[PDB]
Each structure stands twice: as C-alpha cells, then as structure tokens.
Amino acid sequence: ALKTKPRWDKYDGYVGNYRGVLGEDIDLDTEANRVLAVGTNSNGAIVVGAGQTGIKGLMIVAVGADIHGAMLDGGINNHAGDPQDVGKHGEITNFQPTVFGRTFGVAISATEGNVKLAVNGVDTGNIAYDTSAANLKSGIVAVDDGFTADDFTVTGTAPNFTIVTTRTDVTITASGEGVTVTEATSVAAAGTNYYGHADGTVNAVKGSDGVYVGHTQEADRLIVNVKDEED
C-alpha cells in the first residue's frame, strides 16, 4: 500500500505485560506508531524514556490516519491520563528502530578557504574550512528563514561535526565545494540486540544508558525480552 508500521504480534497481557496510564501527552508526529522504550515517573504513570525507575518495558501507541495520511488527533490512548499497554515479553512485527529529530554528519574536504551549506535549499553565509563548533551553529542560524538557534544543536571538531535537530522539517545539505553532508539513517538489521535508552529511543547501540529490550531474528521482527533497568 505505502508503509508498514510497528505492531505487537504476540502480547499476552497476564505475564507482567501491564496496563498503566500515561504521565504526559504522546506526540502524534514524533512518537505515535513507533516502538517507545518506557519507564514510570514518581507517580503510577507511564513515561517515554527513563522515569524514576529506569526503562521497564516497550510501548506502541497505535494511532490511525485519515485518507490523506494525517494522524487522528481526538484519540483516547495518547493523552495524559489515558490508559496504555506496556510489554516485557512478546513479539513486535514490522519492527523499526526509533529515533527523534534529524541528525546530519558534516565533514570538510577543503584544507584552505571557505565552504557553504544549504538549509532547506537556501545558502548559508561562508564558513572557514576551520570554523569553530560555535560558528557552524552561528552560520546555520544566520539566515532569514525563521528557525533560529532554539532548535539546532552542534558538536564536533574542525574536520567534522554533527548537526542534531528536534524538528523533522529542517534539512541540511552541502551546496559549495569542499564539504560533504550525510543525514544519519536507521533500519533494522537481522540477528541484532536492540536497546532502549533514557530518551525513549530503541537502537542497536548500547552507549552508557542502554537497557536490553530484545533481539530481532529476521530484521522485520523483534523478540521482546526486557532486562528491566535497576538501581
């Protein structure tokens, strides 16, 4: 048709897969129809990411869409205080990793002079082949497009940087010679261990906070078996 989207295939509901209530509203553009790593806050309530307890399960907020492909707003399973289902043991099919915003690797091929990047196709002010991480931020912010500093993050050292963003509607590219840009990408990989994080993302990498949530088999599936986070 056009897209498949993650769903519980096996979820029992008597074996410590549990009902709770949300502590917060779920973002329908950013968090619905995704595999969310979840904990509980200092009240009885489900939160995306590490609450008071750390990660205790996975949640899929299943939401329909209109015939034009937008999410149905008036749902009863996605606002604060709505009831939701959290799984520790089960299978998720049409599985995909979960990531928030956009992130771009920038790297400079030039060893002298200046280079140029485009934000949503409009060109940035010139930046040195040795600009500071502070001056990629200042360059990228400084165009009359209305995004401003408030929704960019930058980190790196002169040869390369990561431009992170919380929004989906901003795209970085190269436009001048002497610089290359790749958006990061995530897709499920067969025979891999997946890991929930304090953000609520589910990824193949355990950093300093990753809590094992399951392993895939064939890439389109996840066998969920949450090694619950502990103190």
Binding site: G74, G75, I76
Partner: protein
C-alpha cells in the same frame, strides 16, 4: 461501606464460610441494602434531570440577509439582490471501562454461591458510581475535551467556558469568545447576591422568568443552611441584602408569618422532578443535595420560550453488542483458574451550553473543578 479494596485472584483463605461459633457470614452481604437504596434513589433523580439521549441538531448562525426597494423612474432599471447562510454542529465523547474477577479452582470448590453473588453486586454498585461520576464530571469539569468521528477531530464541550462558538446576541447583551458560566462568588460565604448573580448568567441569554423558564438550584447543606436565613430587606453575609424571602416547602417545619404583608415569592411544590425541594428564593427552587460538594452552587434552567432541557447528552456505542453493562467470559476457564470481565462503554457532552451555570463560593482566583468530579481523579464518586 469502607474505602478498602481487595484485588487479585480469589483463593482458599479468601473464602467466607459459617464461623466455628455458627455465624453465617454469607447471610450478611446485603446488610447495607438500605444505604445503597438511599444512594440509588439520589443518583437516579439527579440523572433523570441532568441527562438526555444525544441528538445532532444543525446549529443556526443568525445572518443579516438584507434587501431594499428604491424609487422607480420611467426610463432605467433597479439594482439586484442576494443572501448568505451558515450553520454548525456539536458532538459528544465515548470511552471504555472494564473490571475483572478471578477465582482459583480451590476457591470455586468450597465457596458459597452467596459470596460470588456479593462480588457481582459490589461490581454492579461500582458500575453505578462510575456512570454517575461521569454524568457529574461532564457538567463540573470546565475543560474542553477532544473526540474523533469519520476521521474528523472535534471539541466536546462543557457549559460556556471561554472555548468554542460564543453565545449568540440577545437584545443588547453581546458575548465575546471568553464568556463563561464557571464563576466565583468573590466571598468566602454565600450571599443572597450570589443567587442574583447566578440567575443573571441564565437570564443574559434570555433564559428567564419573563420567558417562562423554570429554575432549579442544587446546593450542599453547607450553602442551604445560609440560604434558609434570607429575609426580604434584611442584611445577610458580606453586607448583601436579600431582595426576596426564602419560602419553605410544604414538607419543612412551620414558621410564623412575620408581617401582615406575607412573604415575597411563591411556595414551591415539595419536589422538582423527583428531587425533594426545601424551598424557593426568588425564582430558584432550592434542592438540598450532598452530591453537590460544599462551596458549589449549580443553577439549571428548564422549559420556557427557549425550550431548555436537561444539560448533558448521553452517547452509547454504535455497535448493539457494546450497549449497557456487559459480563464477558474470561481467558481462563476451568483449572487452575477461572476469570471473567465486566465492561461498559458510553460518553457525554453538553450541547445546550448556556442553560446552566456553576458558582464556586470563594474570595479569589479562577473556578476550580471539585476534585471528586475532575476527569483524571478516579472511577468512583
């Protein structure tokens, strides 16, 4: 009964049996039936006055639609004409509630049928307390809800609350987007003035004694014990002076008529719908009701030229099998466990948004929903 809730699988040792000294405890489950009946009659009288089956009227928007003649001439011709039209609709929410009961095979081997019938009855009692809470919460919680039908998202509304279509103009009263029927007294104790200020919220839209509108005031004992003191031309709380007499109903204890003139008002019938009326003040029939929390007045209009009705629309699920309280077979069936479910689905919304008003009696700040009728607070009154 006490606010204590055992949950989980019923096991041996959760059994009730005749005691060693011969007390048949399984005879005693119905021992609160009188209090439950007094609670069942109070809720049913309120539900029958506050609620009605939903309909979807097409809401009229008043339009200009002007045209005029001009003076004719023997040569030449007059100008043309044309007219506008516009309308809207309002909707209702729906939500799903359930409960489970579960027994071990050892429990079911030894149990008296009277014990599992008591658990059934106590679930049927928790069902009333839920549907009554949602009827009250639909009127008391001044927050706007969202719902979806035919892929369209729409607001579900309480009384006028500063959201949605403003009230239409009436005579010279004209209303902006912020207009609200959730108000405060501005004083820590109820005045006769507050019963005038509350009446004005219905009368500003034409729902009025002149229009033939009947009025009901629901209040707690905490307020009615002040309202019983209102004597015409005598000062009350906060320097207010009562414009009318409180008139006791035929059921109340008698009073000496204090003046040759007689009391300014009319003596009410002893009931409004099924509720027991304590008396009137001005045009309000006053009902004593502990299901209204202390420090709140609820004024409701009925009838008149505007044909006011019950404020809250009740929605059932479109599937015939989804309707009423239903008992459902569980996933565990024989051994070692048996389980079963109870489920209800229904919802609410206010279409007639001006026909009632709520006042919180306090000095300052916005109106607060009483916690007992706030949406997130629980499943029992």
């Amino acid at each position: 009964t006490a606010p204590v809730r055992q949950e989980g699988i019923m096991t041996q040792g959760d059994l009730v049996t005749v005691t060693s000294d011969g007390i048949d405890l399984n005879a005693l489950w119905n021992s609160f039936a009188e209090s439950i009946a007094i609670y069942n009659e109070a809720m049913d009288n309120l539900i029958q006055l506050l609620t009605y089956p939903v309909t979807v009227p097409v809401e009229p928007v008043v339009q200009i639609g002007e045209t005029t003649f001009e003076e004719a001439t023997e040569l030449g011709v007059p100008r043309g004409a044309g007219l506008p039209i516009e309308v809207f609709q309002m909707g209702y929410d729906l939500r799903h509630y359930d409960k489970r009961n579960a027994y071990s095979w050892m429990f079911l081997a030894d149990a008296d049928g009277r014990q599992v019938e008591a658990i059934h009855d106590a679930v049927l009692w928790a069902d009333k307390r839920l549907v009554f809470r949602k009827v009250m919460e639909a009127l008391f919680d001044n927050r706007t809800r969202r719902a979806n039908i035919r892929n369209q998202a729409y607001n579900v509304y309480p009384l006028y609350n500063g959201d949605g279509v403003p009230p239409p103009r009436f005579k010279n009263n004209v209303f902006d987007e912020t207009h609200s029927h959730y108000v405060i007294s501005h004083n820590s104790v109820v005045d006769s003035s507050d019963l005038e200020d509350l009446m004005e919220l219905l009368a500003e839209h034409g729902y009025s004694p002149q229009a033939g509108t009947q009025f009901l005031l629901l209040a707690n004992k905490a307020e009615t014990d002040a309202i019983r003191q209102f004597r015409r031309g005598v000062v009350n709380n906060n320097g207010a002076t009562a414009g009318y007499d409180f008139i006791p109903s035929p059921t109340q204890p008698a009073m000496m008529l204090p003046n040759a003139e007689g009391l300014l008002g009319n003596q009410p019938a002893p009931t409004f719908g099924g509720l027991a009326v304590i008396g009137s003040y001005g045009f309000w029939n006053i009902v004593e009701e502990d299901y209204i929390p202390p420090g709140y007045l609820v004024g409701v209009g009925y009838g008149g030229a505007f044909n006011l009705g019950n404020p809250v629309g009740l929605r059932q699920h479109a599937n015939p099998a989804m309707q009423g309280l239903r008992i459902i077979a569980g996933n565990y069936q024989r051994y070692p466990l048996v389980d079963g479910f109870y489920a209800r689905s229904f919802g609410t919304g206010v279409r007639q948004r001006g026909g009632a008003a709520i006042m919180q009696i306090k000095a300052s700040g916005a109106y607060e929903c009483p916690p007992i009728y706030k949406k997130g607070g629980g499943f029992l009154v």
